[PDB]
Design a protein around this ligand. Sequence first.
Ligand SMILES: Cc1cc2nc3c(=O)[nH]c(=O)nc-3n(C[C@H](O)[C@H](O)[C@H](O)COP(=O)(O)OP(=O)(O)OC[C@H]3O[C@@H](n4cnc5c(N)ncnc54)[C@H](O)[C@@H]3O)c2cc1C
Ligand SMILES: NC(=O)C1=CN([C@@H]2O[C@H](COP(=O)(O)OP(=O)(O)OC[C@H]3O[C@@H](n4cnc5c(N)ncnc54)[C@H](O)[C@@H]3O)[C@@H](O)[C@H]2O)C=CC1
Length: 520
Amino acid sequence: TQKMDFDAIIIGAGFGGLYSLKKLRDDFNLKVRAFDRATEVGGTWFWNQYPGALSDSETHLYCYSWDKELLQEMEIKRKYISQPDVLAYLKRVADKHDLRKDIQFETGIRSAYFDEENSFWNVTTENDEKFTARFLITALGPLSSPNWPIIKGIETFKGELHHTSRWPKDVTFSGKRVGVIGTGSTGVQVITAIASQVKHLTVFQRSAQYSVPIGNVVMSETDVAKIKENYDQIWENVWNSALGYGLNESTLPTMSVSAEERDKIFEKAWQEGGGFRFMFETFGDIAVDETANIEAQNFIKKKISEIVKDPFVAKKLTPTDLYACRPLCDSGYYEIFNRDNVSLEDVKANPIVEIKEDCVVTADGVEHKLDMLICATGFDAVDGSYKRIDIRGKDGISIKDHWKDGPNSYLGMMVSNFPNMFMVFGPNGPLANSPPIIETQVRWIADLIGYAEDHQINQIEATKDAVDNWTNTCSDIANKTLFAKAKNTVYLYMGGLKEYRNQISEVSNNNYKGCLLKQS
Ligand SMILES: Cc1cc2nc3c(=O)[nH]c(=O)nc-3n(C[C@H](O)[C@H](O)[C@H](O)COP(=O)(O)OP(=O)(O)OC[C@H]3O[C@@H](n4cnc5c(N)ncnc54)[C@H](O)[C@@H]3O)c2cc1C
Ligand SMILES: NC(=O)C1=CN([C@@H]2O[C@H](COP(=O)(O)OP(=O)(O)OC[C@H]3O[C@@H](n4cnc5c(N)ncnc54)[C@H](O)[C@@H]3O)[C@@H](O)[C@H]2O)C=CC1
């Protein structure tokens, strides 16, 4: 009966898809084919090429760890790695391991239907090409379709209108009046990078957020060669940590030291740089205790009032949140608002009501004349990338229907009613550095598929109770955190990378409890 085109089909050629291809094809000798709409590997690092695109984690850790030779060969130019260098790195990964011969570029996957009779997947591209594979590996990433601001007359603007997710080449800023909507991580990076290049910059800020310096500096040859000399212990620290950012994750309570010592600890992380460092290397209860969280707020607020000299602009930049989850990272964001060519518009108190052929109009009637409008307004949720595909498992239920109230899964990798489908960097996963999470899930999925090939089972599916057990574990951990109060279905597992690896290890050791292994 079953002919089958491949043993596994992968959707995505980013960090998750490239390692899924390497592990399944070369270490388990399976017949694999990967698909991506992009013309080249990279994932978000191919799509997102906006000004100032920079990694949150340091260069020596935002990479693969499974190729020891690649680690020694790796270019560590600056403390953090820019978008063109991440793209070049992932291209080198594809070059060394001969990955492109099994990737079909310029090809979008329209639908994936599970055949309960033969226990494989019917995958159809957007160009009506049909492939069959026993297993479906979905490496879609954490971000979905670009989120545009719903503003009356947005289609009327005659100037340049760019979304940061679709940043075109050859964009020039000199002599232009530019506006930026959005002050998230992407907006902060764009604003800091282009303020000195434009004639005038207007920042349309709906919600001011906390941001700490990133401290991106050049890495000397002694800085680099010494990292590669201790790379084995560095990665052992990652697997033994909660975030995988190479931090000395603190257990010290914030209010257990004096105000003078508390200031020294915050200042030390402020000088070194890093958003996760300021939160989790300083003290161990910043995300848990309200009094601790407020202390971290007041340090950044004090830094804002000192950097921007106009106290009324500093007031507009100061977040009104009672509690603060994650701060952003910047390379001179607050210094930008001291410039003569930068205007900050509080769009919560003075909302945008309309934009015309040459301007953005706020509620006060002021027409902000612009030659270019940049929308750094974010994306849809992680489950959007899945609901954007026509995925149907048992009985024909679509992932649109099964996740109509939000995403749920088992260990962040398996979905009930969708057998032989394994998610890489999917929802309900851990909150940590992405490459360590991706590597952890790809190795776990590959070991289960190899365990399947030897024990002659052809269908793997997580039970409904195992998924609901995972939702309880995530909610039990998250409700101990202030992350629930500030900005049912639980989107993230918050136990850390080490405890997440403990969770999935107990499953693989206990004969994959919660999963249903059908023999043939
Ligand atoms: C500028 C920037 C900096 C970041 N820095 C960090 C950091 O320091 N630390 C960290 O942990 N995380 C960071 N992230 C987030 C995260 O690490 C990245 O998204 C990471 O590359 C994960 O990639 P991925 O391979 O899981 O998915 P992606 O890189 O998003 O790859 C998804 C791919 O799947 C393809 N695809 C989706 N649907 C279909 C379909 N139906 N058919 C065909 N193809 C499809 C898409 O074309 C896309 O290329 C950052 C993100 C950005 C944008
Ligand atoms: N350095 C890094 O590691 C990076 C990380 N990321 C991640 O990717 C995700 C995407 O983040 P971003 O692209 O920054 O988007 P975001 O969702 O973080 O920010 C969107 C911004 O646009 C504003 N906005 C949205 N709709 C609006 C409207 N109608 N009117 C006015 N303002 C509006 C919001 O106030 C918000 O500040 C983030 O969660 C982030 O963690 C993204 C880029 C870089």
